[PDB]
Design an enzyme around this catalytic site. Structure first.
Site, PDB file in Angstrom:
ATOM      1  N   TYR A  27      19.985   5.109  10.476  1.00 45.89           N
ATOM      2  CA  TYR A  27      19.786   6.537  10.698  1.00 45.89           C
ATOM      3  C   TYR A  27      20.808   7.048  11.711  1.00 45.89           C
ATOM      4  O   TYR A  27      21.043   6.417  12.745  1.00 45.89           O
ATOM      5  CB  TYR A  27      18.368   6.830  11.198  1.00 45.89           C
ATOM      6  CG  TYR A  27      18.243   8.259  11.668  1.00 45.89           C
ATOM      7  CD1 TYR A  27      18.092   9.297  10.758  1.00 45.89           C
ATOM      8  CD2 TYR A  27      18.317   8.574  13.015  1.00 45.89           C
ATOM      9  CE1 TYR A  27      18.003  10.616  11.190  1.00 45.89           C
ATOM     10  CE2 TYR A  27      18.235   9.877  13.452  1.00 45.89           C
ATOM     11  CZ  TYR A  27      18.077  10.891  12.546  1.00 45.89           C
ATOM     12  OH  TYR A  27      17.988  12.182  13.011  1.00 45.89           O
ATOM     13  N   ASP A  53      19.589  -1.349   6.197  1.00 44.42           N
ATOM     14  CA  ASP A  53      18.771  -0.281   5.638  1.00 44.42           C
ATOM     15  C   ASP A  53      19.487   1.050   5.822  1.00 44.42           C
ATOM     16  O   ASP A  53      19.856   1.409   6.945  1.00 44.42           O
ATOM     17  CB  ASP A  53      17.396  -0.255   6.313  1.00 44.42           C
ATOM     18  CG  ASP A  53      16.513   0.844   5.771  1.00 44.42           C
ATOM     19  OD1 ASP A  53      16.695   1.991   6.217  1.00 44.42           O
ATOM     20  OD2 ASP A  53      15.656   0.571   4.897  1.00 44.42           O
ATOM     21  N   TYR A  58      20.891  10.168   5.066  1.00 44.37           N
ATOM     22  CA  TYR A  58      21.552   9.950   6.354  1.00 44.37           C
ATOM     23  C   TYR A  58      23.025  10.343   6.304  1.00 44.37           C
ATOM     24  O   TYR A  58      23.657  10.491   7.361  1.00 44.37           O
ATOM     25  CB  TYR A  58      21.438   8.475   6.805  1.00 44.37           C
ATOM     26  CG  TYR A  58      20.033   7.871   6.913  1.00 44.37           C
ATOM     27  CD1 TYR A  58      18.887   8.666   6.918  1.00 44.37           C
ATOM     28  CD2 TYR A  58      19.869   6.481   7.025  1.00 44.37           C
ATOM     29  CE1 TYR A  58      17.613   8.093   7.019  1.00 44.37           C
ATOM     30  CE2 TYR A  58      18.604   5.895   7.134  1.00 44.37           C
ATOM     31  CZ  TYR A  58      17.475   6.708   7.126  1.00 44.37           C
ATOM     32  OH  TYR A  58      16.203   6.151   7.213  1.00 44.37           O
ATOM     33  N   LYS A  87      17.750   4.754  -0.334  1.00 40.60           N
ATOM     34  CA  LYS A  87      16.577   5.576  -0.604  1.00 40.60           C
ATOM     35  C   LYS A  87      16.925   6.782  -1.463  1.00 40.60           C
ATOM     36  O   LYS A  87      17.958   7.429  -1.267  1.00 40.60           O
ATOM     37  CB  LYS A  87      15.916   6.051   0.703  1.00 40.60           C
ATOM     38  CG  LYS A  87      15.759   4.936   1.732  1.00 40.60           C
ATOM     39  CD  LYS A  87      14.812   5.296   2.860  1.00 40.60           C
ATOM     40  CE  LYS A  87      14.767   4.197   3.920  1.00 40.60           C
ATOM     41  NZ  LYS A  87      16.012   4.127   4.726  1.00 40.60           N
ATOM     42  N   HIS A 120      12.035   8.109  -0.636  1.00 39.03           N
ATOM     43  CA  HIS A 120      12.084   8.371   0.800  1.00 39.03           C
ATOM     44  C   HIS A 120      10.773   8.966   1.323  1.00 39.03           C
ATOM     45  O   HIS A 120      10.411   8.748   2.484  1.00 39.03           O
ATOM     46  CB  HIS A 120      13.262   9.297   1.084  1.00 39.03           C
ATOM     47  CG  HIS A 120      13.853   9.157   2.452  1.00 39.03           C
ATOM     48  ND1 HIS A 120      15.214   9.194   2.664  1.00 39.03           N
ATOM     49  CD2 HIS A 120      13.281   9.029   3.675  1.00 39.03           C
ATOM     50  CE1 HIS A 120      15.460   9.083   3.957  1.00 39.03           C
ATOM     51  NE2 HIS A 120      14.307   8.977   4.594  1.00 39.03           N
ATOM     52  N   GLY A 223      10.043   3.496  19.318  1.00 36.56           N
ATOM     53  CA  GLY A 223       9.552   4.788  19.755  1.00 36.56           C
ATOM     54  C   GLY A 223      10.518   5.938  19.599  1.00 36.56           C
ATOM     55  O   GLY A 223      10.274   7.006  20.176  1.00 36.56           O
TER      56      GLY A 223
END
Ligand code: 2BA
Length: 316
Positions: A27, A53, A58, A87, A120, A223
């Protein structure tokens, strides 16, 4: 550097394929240039990541594919020892758009197949070039497409050999049951990739996925509102185990059978995250970490909230 392949630490998928137990996420935040995505992906392969991944949305599939191609040419890794996920985006959920979107991703990635291709989200948006279509008031332009109809085309993509395994992302319990119970189902999803971390530990969804041999893959594992990495209980467990807070947070997920996506653009953090298999947490420390759960969602996908299949209203 020894590759963290399925030969080293893998999880068995319900279609027989193996996924490396730790992945590298890609990402890309707005503030990060695409040249940094390329650099970070090259370094991740160099230092031992084998599960990469990414996603169409993105906008870095080209850079990830360049990193993979340059690593292969340099002899760092062979294609069969990599596990590449991408995705299908919301604007291409209409059945007639699925396989062209996959082939477009494969061309951008310079790959002939991906190891895993996933929806996604369960929510479709209006088809077109804009990945986030909106009206004059800024509301998302949605569509009505049963994700079971989309799923049938992912099944066809697997049977065509363009993807080895298929799965989903950001599905809830009811939505997974719709796929599993759909008439004429050919292939179960091998995974449900969701936000998961010490403050959103997904115990109920994980239980369900385990009961169906679906692997939970975690993004936002550190997080991404409270700052998880500064949590005082987490940092006490970290000190007790002589590991960093990030490594405790990742190990928590690994020990629960979750496949986390670890990402950093800093080479030292990439290498630190690979040390997650070098220690384990006691049952007491796992119970202590269970107690941090807040059911706090850092990534609620508010742009999808108007749709009836918005996945995060229900308890799990
Ligand atoms: N060993 C270590 N020690 C200390 N800190 C460490 C570390 N390894 C990683 N970090 C830091 O943890 C941050 C959060 O990682 P997380 O995987 O939770 O969160 C990821 C990613 O999951 C999250 N994210 C945001 N929007 C997302 C979306 N739409 N889809 C997927 N992920 C998204 O944004 C974050 C992007 O990664 P970024 O590098 O900017 O931010 C990383 C990185 O700065």
């Amino acid at each position: 550097f020894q590759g963290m392949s399925s030969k080293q630490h893998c999880v068995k998928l319900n279609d027989g394929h193996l996924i490396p137990a730790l992945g590298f996420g890609t990402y890309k935040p707005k503030e990060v240039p695409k040249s940094k995505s390329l650099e970070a992906a090259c370094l991740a392969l160099d230092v031992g990541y084998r599960h990469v991944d990414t996603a169409y949305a993105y906008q870095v599939e080209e850079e990830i594919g360049q990193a993979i191609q340059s690593a292969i040419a340099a002899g760092v890794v062979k294609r069969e020892d990599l596990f590449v996920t991408t995705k299908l985006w919301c604007t291409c959920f209409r059945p007639e758009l699925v396989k062209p979107a996959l082939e477009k991703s494969l061309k951008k990635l310079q790959l002939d197949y991906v190891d895993l291709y996933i929806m996604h989200y369960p929510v479709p948006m209006k088809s077109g070039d804009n990945d986030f279509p909106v009206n004059e008031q800024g509301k998302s332009l949605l569509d009505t497409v049963d994700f079971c109809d989309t799923w049938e085309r992912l099944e066809e993509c697997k049977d065509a050999g363009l993807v080895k395994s298929i799965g989903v992302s950001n599905f809830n319990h009811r939505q997974l049951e719709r796929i599993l119970n759909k008439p004429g189902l050919k292939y179960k999803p091998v995974c449900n990739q969701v936000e998961c971390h010490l403050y959103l530990n997904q115990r109920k969804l994980l239980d369900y996925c385990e009961s169906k041999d679906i692997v939970l893959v975690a993004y936002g594992a550190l997080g991404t509102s409270p700052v998880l990495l500064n949590d005082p209980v987490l940092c006490d467990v970290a000190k007790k185990n002589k590991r960093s807070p990030a490594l405790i947070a990742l190990r928590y997920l690994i020990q629960r059978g979750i496949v986390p996506l670890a990402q950093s653009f800093k080479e030292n953090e990439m290498r630190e995250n690979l040390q997650v298999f070098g220690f384990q947490l006691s049952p007491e420390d796992m119970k202590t970490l269970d107690g941090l759960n807040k059911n706090f969602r850092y990534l609620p996908a508010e742009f999808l909230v108007d749709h009836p299949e918005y996945p995060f209203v229900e308890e799990y």
